[PDB]
């Protein structure tokens, strides 16, 4: 190869337009039925250790 190189500096506009897909999506969170704490669905609650209505974990 022969070392490709940018021909022009990218403009502020074109740099930030390329970043129009970069914003984060917030985490998916549901309340724990036992302790009402927000937490990801399908995970053992990190605040009380309950899953499927029963204690699984010391926390």
């Amino acid at each position: 190869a022969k070392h490709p190189v940018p021909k022009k500096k990218t403009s502020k506009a074109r740099r930030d337009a390329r970043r129009s897909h970069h914003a984060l999506t917030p985490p998916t969170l549901v309340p724990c039925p036992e302790c009402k704490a927000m937490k990801p669905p399908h995970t053992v609650c990190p605040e009380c250790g309950y899953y499927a209505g029963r204690k699984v974990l010391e926390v």
Binding site: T43, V44, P46
Partner: protein, 118 residues
């Protein structure tokens, strides 16, 4: 393509992946419950279930087969005398995987507990 191909690779060559499964088995049978990454936890279900099922048959042949993977005679003795009898009436499902809420700090990996069922 990967069409209808079974089995994760876990970025390990063949003998390392096998030694991973054997090692996680020993740890799971020793402690009853371990924490790993979700994909490792999922793959370990089938590996250990098979060894528990051979312990349920209980014969000499089964004991020698299980020892190929577990090597620890005291551990196999524990699997035959204490673990396997509590699954006499249970047909499969000797292990469960549950996903943990918090990822690991240094690499973001999602984690899961694997455990023997009651």
């Amino acid at each position: 393509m990967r069409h209808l191909k079974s089995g994760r690779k876990l970025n390990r060559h063949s003998s390392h992946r096998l030694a991973l499964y054997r090692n996680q088995a020993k740890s799971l049978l020793t402690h009853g419950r371990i924490t790993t990454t979700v994909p490792k936890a999922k793959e370990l279900r089938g590996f250990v279930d098979h060894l528990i099922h051979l312990a349920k048959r209980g014969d000499l042949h089964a004991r020698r087969l299980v020892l190929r993977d577990l090597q620890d005679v005291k551990l196999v003795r524990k699997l035959f005398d204490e673990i396997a009898p509590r699954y006499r009436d249970r047909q499969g499902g000797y292990t469960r995987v549950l996903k943990l809420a918090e990822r690991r700090r240094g690499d973001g990996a999602p984690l899961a507990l694997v455990e023997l069922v009651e």
